Enzyme design. Structure first.
Site, short mmCIF file in Angstrom:
data_model
loop_
_atom_site.label_atom_id
_atom_site.label_comp_id
_atom_site.label_asym_id
_atom_site.label_seq_id
_atom_site.Cartn_x
_atom_site.Cartn_y
_atom_site.Cartn_z
N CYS A 46 -29.80 -19.72 -16.36
CA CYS A 46 -29.18 -20.08 -17.64
C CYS A 46 -28.06 -19.12 -17.98
CB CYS A 46 -30.22 -20.14 -18.78
SG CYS A 46 -29.53 -20.41 -20.46
N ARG A 52 -27.66 -17.25 -22.07
CA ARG A 52 -28.71 -16.37 -22.57
C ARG A 52 -28.21 -15.25 -23.47
NH1 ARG A 52 -31.52 -14.30 -17.35
NH2 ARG A 52 -29.63 -15.04 -16.23
N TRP A 101 -26.72 -25.92 -27.25
CA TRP A 101 -25.51 -26.72 -27.28
C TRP A 101 -24.93 -26.76 -25.87
CZ3 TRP A 101 -26.03 -22.22 -30.20
CH2 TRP A 101 -25.44 -21.09 -29.62
N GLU A 127 -21.15 -29.48 -18.14
CA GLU A 127 -22.39 -30.23 -17.99
C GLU A 127 -22.17 -31.71 -18.24
OE1 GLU A 127 -26.07 -27.93 -19.37
OE2 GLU A 127 -24.58 -27.33 -20.87
#
Ligand code: HEM
Ligand code: HEM
Ligand SMILES: Cc1cc(N)nc2cc(-c3cccc(CN)c3)c(F)cc12
Ligand SMILES: Cc1cc(N)nc2cc(-c3cccc(CN)c3)c(F)cc12
Ligand SMILES: C[C@H](O)[C@H](O)[C@H]1CNc2nc(N)[nH]c(=O)c2N1
Ligand SMILES: C[C@H](O)[C@H](O)[C@H]1CNc2nc(N)[nH]c(=O)c2N1
Ligand SMILES: [Zn+2]
Lengths: 419, 413
Positions: free
Chosen positions: B109, B112, B281, B286
């Site tokens: 991720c 973070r 969000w 993506e």
């Protein structure tokens, strides 16, 4: 144990047994993955200089065994005699010498084993030049000039490697001090910025410090700095007519040619080390043809390199106010369009990252089909632009270390005891 | 034992001591690396105390209370429960801490830097699917916040005997349906075709259109899952237009504002929270790169390049590359105009680098998965591409679990 790799775009699964032959550590453990460390491991195969007989012979017996296994002759007359032959050589000289056939097999299999190389579908088409008779920097320069001329071949490029004498005791190393045979110079500026290519500032300054008279431009082809048998290195200017160069224009933007950019046609890595049955060839310049992204993404757009995104965006009338306009991404594509168009216009061999990655997946299948596996390093195979719209992005890969191989080696000026 | 990582653009060198704290395997061995494998490789009493002790010791360490009276009491209280009940229950403080550290520890991720601002909803009193729907509705509202998105997770009871699991069958809380056609083509999102079939078979009557918000399929206490329509007014959506290409709106494209992943498993102290939808969000790529351009997805690259007159005969024109950038511009512009939170991949990668340096400074390391952190487009021109990263599995962690329909044993008729 078998291991399976899957392509998530096609669901083709491949089963890997070849990894059972892997020799050197990758750096990883079951608790830690180091697959993005540039040099994870230092697991060599012998003490840096002359090993003992019980240290060198096992590695040689490994390679000879593999080579005769390759040619459907394991345990044959030649194989058994060759073992004894390498025994007697090691007994009498602490080293041994490769047959010309074994040298070629070895070179070709180092390439085939190069897990970071997207281009390996070509591995068996390598032209090997034996330079093991070379004794001086002057002779090294002659062999290199011929390499360049053969491999350039007027733009229809051909893969080649030139192999200089193997390391013996470490005091008598052959080295090409340049990182590639053809690179541009980088100049430290009075105001603190940099002219030319920043990757080569340090080497460029060694050259000036060695007596090179720099023309002090943006695209100054560097001299060759050649070391034979452990002596101090020597400067040589590659004959210009042998250095093929492509001016970068753009099929659409006519203002692009006015940016004054060019790049050379021949990538020729000269600072790596080739390892075959315990023998280390510290000088082995090898060369192919560019993937376009190597020039237009990394050489031109990295921040500590040419950094021309800056300007290409300006001439494009782009909103450079915030990142979210994606002005970097947009210039980056145009620049790579131009490199490809320029090289293709001048009929200089070049491959785009879509063709190259497609080829590598085909190559990957080929290898799993006939070899039981294929070491590949996802982190390096995936192109540095448009990763996910290339077929390798959705391809699982196993990375592991096979011998023969190319290996990194320290820059010779960190370790050179001058005369 | 220390371990170093280098940034090859800036020469910053960080020193990882935190990696000694891992005790979960990576699938790599000393002689093979599996860093690009998508997925490499219930507890009895004996297995559970050490896992619990591990988490409790970690928690009391984090609050400078290690070895305290309240620390030793909690340990003994936990032991009592694993003996009396074969399990134990997390305190509310422990649960918040665990939830936040699982995010902190998610090596894939890139967002973070936001980990400590996670809003934790305790839904461990839930007993039925209708209860679950209520909790999820109040997650969606709140996290969406009229476009000013806020991170949040909702945590459901936790696994007991494997037989009474809570599961969200949806992979995200808001996804678009996908309908395969008799002629082989696909309507809507090809990624969700199987789940669409499952819903239809359970009774959902689909509008059979391009952007149908799927229904929630909610399983409580190991019972058969149930359908529920998310109230349309809680689903924030962004119509995708482009700032230069007036024709872009004619593609009829839109996406939902709230990415909210619901099929993973949250592990804290040996306890397994098999339903734990969490949300933040979007990073633009993506949607713009993987949602609309993945060949196995909405695949509008061909259409966009057409309307751009690009030369689609030869790859080396780089039409694919060129059409990808424009889609991703349109995605960012659309969200920023409708004032729905979004981050572009440059800003996000820059933030993650700051975050990583800070986490080395204050924590002694930061596990990161280079293969996932590097954006799926324009990789080398973001700073993470040149950043060396070490990958290892700290716990609490989010984990993958099998799809519920591959393991659920059914009850009705
Ligand atoms: C024929 C066309 C070839 C193409 C298009 C090609 C492409 C590439 C590219 C793009 C890389 C990554 C470079 C970077 O991003 O810095 C790479 C790595 C590499 N290539 Fe190739 N290559 C070719 C030929 C060859 C040949 C002839 C050899 C040697 C016989 C070779 C050996 C290697 C090695 C050893 C590495 C990585 C070594 C390491 O860092 O561990 N390549 N290749
Ligand atoms: C708030 C802004 C956030 C951003 C921008 C963000 C961004 C991303 C991105 C781009 C990915 C890669 C997904 C892909 O490309 O397939 C990812 C993975 C992930 N994110 Fe974040 N995320 C955010 C918030 C959160 C939160 C709140 C959580 C949990 C509480 C979380 C947990 C994860 C996990 C667990 C993964 C990887 C899961 C796996 O191993 O497959 N993220 N994130
Ligand atoms: C032969 C060849 C062709 C090409 N087109 N590209 C190549 C790139 C590398 C390479 C490997 C590791 C690091 C670096 C950068 N120092 C380059 C290399 F060895 C050989 C290449
Ligand atoms: C919370 C959150 C926000 C965001 N912006 N993105 C996220 C992406 C994933 C994710 C993880 C694995 C695979 C995939 C691919 N669908 C997505 C995820 F869990 C959570 C995300
Ligand atoms: C095969 C490969 O490991 C796989 O496609 C991974 C690569 N990296 C990724 N990175 C992100 N952000 N998202 C992904 O789905 C993937 N997929
Ligand atoms: C940190 C990271 O591993 C490093 O920058 C690598 C990443 N992948 C790469 N991939 C290629 N092809 N070439 C590179 O130089 C690098 N650099
Ligand atoms: Zn690994």
């Amino acid at each position: 144990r078998f291991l399976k790799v899957k392509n998530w775009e096609t669901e083709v699964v491949l089963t890997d047994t070849l990894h059972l032959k892997s020799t050197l550590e990758t750096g990883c453990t079951e608790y830690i993955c180091m697959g993005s460390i540039m040099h994870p491991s230092q697991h060599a195969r012998r003490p840096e200089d002359v090993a003992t007989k019980d240290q060198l012979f096992p590695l040689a017996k490994e390679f000879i065994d593999q080579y005769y296994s390759s040619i459907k002759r394991f345990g044959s007359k030649a194989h058994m005699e060759r073992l004894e032959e390498v025994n007697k050589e090691i007994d009498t000289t602490s080293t041994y010498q490769l047959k010309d056939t074994e040298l070629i097999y070895g070179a070709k299999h180092a390439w085939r084993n190069a897990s970071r190389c997207v281009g390996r579908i070509q591995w068996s088409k390598l032209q090997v030049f034996d330079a093991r008779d070379c004794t001086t920097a002057h002779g090294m320069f002659n062999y290199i000039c011929n390499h360049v001329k053969y491999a350039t071949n007027k733009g229809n490029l051909r893969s080649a490697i030139t192999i200089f004498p193997q390391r013996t005791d470490g005091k008598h190393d052959f080295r090409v001090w340049n990182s590639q045979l053809i690179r541009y110079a980088g100049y430290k500026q009075p105001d603190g910025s940099t002219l030319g290519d920043p990757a080569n500032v340090q080497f460029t300054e060694i050259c000036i410090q060695q007596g090179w008279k720099p023309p002090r431009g943006r695209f100054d082809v560097l001299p060759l700095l050649l070391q034979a048998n452990g002596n101090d290195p020597e400067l040589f200017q590659i004959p210009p007519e042998l250095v093929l160069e492509v001016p970068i224009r753009h099929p659409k933007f006519e203002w692009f040619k006015d940016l004054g950019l060019k790049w050379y046609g021949l990538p020729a890595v000269s600072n790596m080390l080739l390892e075959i049955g315990g023998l280390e060839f510290s000088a082995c310049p090898f060369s192919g043809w560019y993937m376009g992204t190597e020039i237009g993404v990394r050489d031109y757009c990295d921040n500590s390199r040419y950094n021309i995104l800056e300007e290409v965006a300006k001439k494009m009338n782009l909103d450079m106010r915030k990142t979210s306009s994606l002005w970097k991404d947009q210039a980056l594509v145009e620049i790579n369009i131009a490199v490809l168009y320029s090289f293709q216009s001048d009929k200089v061999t070049i491959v785009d990252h879509h063709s190259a990655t497609e080829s590598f997946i085909k190559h990957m299948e080929n290898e799993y089909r006939c070899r039981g596996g294929c070491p590949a390093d996802w982190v390096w195979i995936v192109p540095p632009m448009s990763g996910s719209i290339t077929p390798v992005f959705h391809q699982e890969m196993l990375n592991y270390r096979l011998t023969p191989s190319f290996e990194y080696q320290p820059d010779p000026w960190n370790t050179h005891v001058w005369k």
